[PDB]
Subunit: 195 residues, 3 copies
Amino acid sequence: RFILTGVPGAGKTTVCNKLAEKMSNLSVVNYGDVIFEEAKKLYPSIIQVREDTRKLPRADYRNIQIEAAKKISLITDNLIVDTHMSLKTPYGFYPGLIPETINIIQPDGIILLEFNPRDVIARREKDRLAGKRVTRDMESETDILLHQQVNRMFAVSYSAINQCYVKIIDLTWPQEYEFQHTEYAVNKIIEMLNF
Amino acid sequence: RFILTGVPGAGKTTVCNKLAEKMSNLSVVNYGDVIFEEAKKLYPSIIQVREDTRKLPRADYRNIQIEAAKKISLITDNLIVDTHMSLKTPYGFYPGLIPETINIIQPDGIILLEFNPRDVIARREKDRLAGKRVTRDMESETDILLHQQVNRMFAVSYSAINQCYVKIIDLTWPQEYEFQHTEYAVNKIIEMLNF
Amino acid sequence: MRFILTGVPGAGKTTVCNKLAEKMSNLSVVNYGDVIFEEAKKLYPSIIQVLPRADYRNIQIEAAKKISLITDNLIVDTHMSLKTPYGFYPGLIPETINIIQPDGIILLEFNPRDVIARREKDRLAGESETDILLHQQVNRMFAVSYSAINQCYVKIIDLTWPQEYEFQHTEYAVNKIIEMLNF
Ligand SMILES: Nc1ncnc2c1ncn2[C@@H]1O[C@H](COP(=O)(O)OP(=O)(O)OP(=O)(O)OP(=O)(O)OP(=O)(O)OC[C@H]2O[C@@H](n3cnc4c(N)ncnc43)[C@H](O)[C@@H]2O)[C@@H](O)[C@H]1O
Ligand SMILES: Nc1ncnc2c1ncn2[C@@H]1O[C@H](COP(=O)(O)OP(=O)(O)OP(=O)(O)OP(=O)(O)OP(=O)(O)OC[C@H]2O[C@@H](n3cnc4c(N)ncnc43)[C@H](O)[C@@H]2O)[C@@H](O)[C@H]1O
Ligand SMILES: Nc1ncnc2c1ncn2[C@@H]1O[C@H](COP(=O)(O)OP(=O)(O)OP(=O)(O)OP(=O)(O)OP(=O)(O)OC[C@H]2O[C@@H](n3cnc4c(N)ncnc43)[C@H](O)[C@@H]2O)[C@@H](O)[C@H]1O
C-alpha cells in the first residue's frame, strides 16, 4: 500500500488509472472523493465542489479527514491512495495527513510526483478553458513551486513519524510527447510494487 | 490564533504594531519580549542582551519558554503571537515552539514573513549604525536564507504534528516606499482573520 | 553532551569522526551501523553476515540502548535517511531519539561534485549531482522533524566551499565541533 500525491492538476489520477490498468491485484481509490462525500454530508450548503472543503474550520475539517480515512482501511488488497500532502486554504497550507489518519491508513510509503510549474499551469488552464475542473486555483509559477516544496516537507515529516518510505519521482524534465510523464511514472511505480 | 514570525531584523515586530492599530478586535502580544524578561529575571548575570537568551541550556530554556507562554495564552477571539520559529544558538538551531508551548498557546496557524536577505542585512546594519539593537548577528546572505528555510521546515513539522496552518507571506519583492512590505503583510493577515 | 553526526554517503563522514576522536580525549565516537550489525550477529547466530522489519526495528532499539550508556560527551555517526528502491527511509525512528536523548544533530553538507569525486576515488581503489542534492535536502528536513519532536538542536556545517588543500573540510568541521563541545 502506498500514498500517491502531487500538486492539483498535474496528472495524479491519470497515473492512478493507468496503474489500475497495468495491474489486476491493485485497486486505486481517491481519498478526495470520500472527503467530498462526508463534507457535503454534514455541510451541504457551503460545500458544492471539492475545493470548498478547504475553507472548513480546523475542527470540522479534521473530523471529515478522520471519517474519510475510514472507508480506505476497508480495502485489503494492495492499494494506492490518491490524496494530497497539503491543501492551500485562505489560512495557509493545511496538512493532508494528521496522526489519526496516518495511523488509520498505515501506508507503507509515500510517492511524490514533482513537475515543472509550467506544465502544471498548462494543464490546469487547458482544462479550465475547456470547461472542466473549472474550480482549481489560478496560481502563479512561484506559488506552485512553493506548494510543491511544501508538499515535500510535509511528506518527510510524516515519514519521520511513521516509518514510511519517501519516494520522489522527478517529472521536471521536458517531455518529448504527451503523457510521457504518465507512462514514465507508471513504469517506475510498477517496478516498485513488484519485489 | 496565529503565531507571527520572521528572521531577526526583517520587521516581525513593526508588522505586529501596525496590525494592533489597523484592527480593534485583535490583541497583539510579544511572546519574545516576555521570554527575554523572564530569562534575565531568573539568570541576570548571564543574560544582558536579547541574543544571550539563546545560549541557555535546553532544559532551563524550555522552562522559560513555558513560563512565558503561560503569561501570553489569552482567550481573546483573535490573537497574534509575536515570536521566532527558530533561534541561532552556538549548538545550532533551536525551535521557537515546543509541544508544551503549542499546547498552551493553542494556535490555529503559523505565519512566516519571508524576506530577501538583502533587505534583512540592510535593516540589521541600519539599526546597528544608529546604536539600535547592536547585538544582532552579522550574517551572510546565505546564512539568512538558511535561517528562513529552517524556519519553514520547523513550521511544517509542527503543522503536521498539530494540524495547524502554515501561511507563507512573500516579501522579497521590491518596495516603492519603505514599509510597503509591512502594509502588504498587514492587509493579507487581516484578510485571513476576516472570513 | 550528545550529538548525532550525519551526512550524505562517501563524502568523508568517518574521516571527520576519526580526526575528532583523536583531537579530543574526553569524547567518544560510535558508528550506529556497526552497532546494529553487532547486535544482529549476536541475536541471530547466522542470519547476519553483511530480516522482518519488526525485528529490524527491535535491534535498532537494542543498539540505541547500548549507546544510551556512554558516560561522557558522545558523537554518534549515523544517517538521517537511506536511499532504497522504495524511496528514502528514515535512519532514525522516534524511539531511537527517545533512547539516545541527543542534545543536537549536526549535518555536514557538501558540494555534490566533491562527493562524487570521493566516491569514485573509493571505487577505483575498492549518483548524479541532482540525486545528491535531493538526498541532502531530505536529510535536512528529517533532522528538523526529529528536532521538532524532541527539541534538540539542528546544526548545519557548510562544506560546499572549495578546498584550499585536501582534508581542510575535515579540520574545519572538527574545529567547529570542538568549539561546540567546549562551551
Ligand atoms: N488529504 C486531504 N485532506 C483534506 N482535504 C483533501 C485531501 N485530499 C483532497 N482534499 C479535498 O479535495 C480537494 C482536492 O481533491 P482532488 O479532486 O482529488 O484533487 P485535484 O488534483 O485538484 O483534482 P483533479 O482530478 O482534477 O487533478 P489530477 O491531479 O488528478 O490530474 P488529471 O489526471 O485529471 O490531469 C490533469 C489534466 O492534464 C492532463 N494530463 C495528465 N497528465 C498529463 C501529461 N503527462 N501531460 C499532459 N497532460 C496531462 C489530463 O488529461 C487532464 O486534462 C482539496 O481541495 C480538498 O478540499
Ligand atoms: N520562541 C522563542 N523561544 C526562545 N527564545 C526566544 C523566542 N522568541 C524570542 N526569543 C529570544 O528573545 C528574543 C525575542 O525578542 P523579540 O523582541 O520578540 O525579537 P528580536 O530578537 O528583537 O528580533 P528583531 O527585533 O530584530 O525583529 P523585528 O523585525 O521585529 O524588528 P523591528 O520591528 O524593530 O524592525 C527591524 C528594523 O528594520 C526596520 N524595518 C522594519 N520593516 C521595514 C521595512 N518594511 N522597510 C524598512 N525598514 C523596516 C525597523 O524600523 C527596524 O529599524 C530573541 O532575540 C531570542 O533571543
Ligand atoms: N540509523 C541507521 N539506521 C539504519 N542503518 C544505519 C543507520 N546508521 C547507519 N546505518 C548503516 O550504516 C551503513 C553505512 O553507513 P555509514 O557507516 O554511517 O557511512 P558510509 O557512507 O557507508 O561510509 P563510507 O566509508 O562509504 O564513507 P564516509 O561517509 O564515512 O567518508 P570517508 O571518510 O570514508 O571518505 C571517503 C573518501 O573521501 C575522502 N575524503 C574524506 N574527506 C576528504 C576531504 N576533506 N578532502 C578530500 N577527500 C576526502 C576519504 O579519504 C576517502 O577517500 C549502512 O548499511 C546503513 O544502513
